[PDB]
Amino acid sequence: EQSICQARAAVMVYDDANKKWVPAGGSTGFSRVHIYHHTGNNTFRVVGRKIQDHQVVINCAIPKGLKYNQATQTFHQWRDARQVYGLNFGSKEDANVFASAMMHALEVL
């Protein structure tokens, strides 16, 4: 598996019951978020690790046809059959790096 981008973001998951964003993995803070490319079957996953303690806070597939929503220049989100994910980027450049790679992945799936 090959990293096609690295971006700084606080990884959030939406608490449907309480209608509130909560930190992925339970601990507030920024992570290094990759998109990893598995070339063997041309699959991509979002994998993010907290800068402080290396905890994996997100590890989710990127399916063909995903709707990736750029709500703001620093807050992007998407949904799967179970959860809603949100990335609160540390900078506009980080959001741009990540969005570029996500859009690339969705084009070649």
Ligand X SMILES: CC(=O)N[C@@H](Cc1ccccc1Cl)C(=O)N1CCC[C@]12C=C[C@@H]1CC[C@@H](C(=O)N3CC[C@@H]4C=C[C@H]5CC[C@H](C(=O)O)N5C(=O)[C@H]43)N1C2=O
- Per DSSP, the three-state class of 92 is helix
Amino acid at 16: D
For residue 30, state whether it binds ligand X (rule: CB under 6 A): no
For residue 38, state whether it binds ligand X (rule: CB under 6 A): no
Q: Which of 35, 62, 88, 94 binds ligand X (CB under 6 A)?
A: 88
Q: Which of 14, 36, 55, 70 binds ligand X (CB under 6 A)?
A: 14
CB 30 within 8 A of CB 90: yes
The CA-based dihedral angle spanning residues 57, 16, 65, 5, taken in that order and rounded to the nearest 10 degrees: -20
Place of tokens 């809603």: 84
* 67-86 binders of ligand X (CB under 6 A): 67, 69, 71-72, 75, 77-79, 84
Contact residues: ligand X, CB under 6 A: 14, 21, 67, 69, 71-72, 75, 77-79, 84, 88
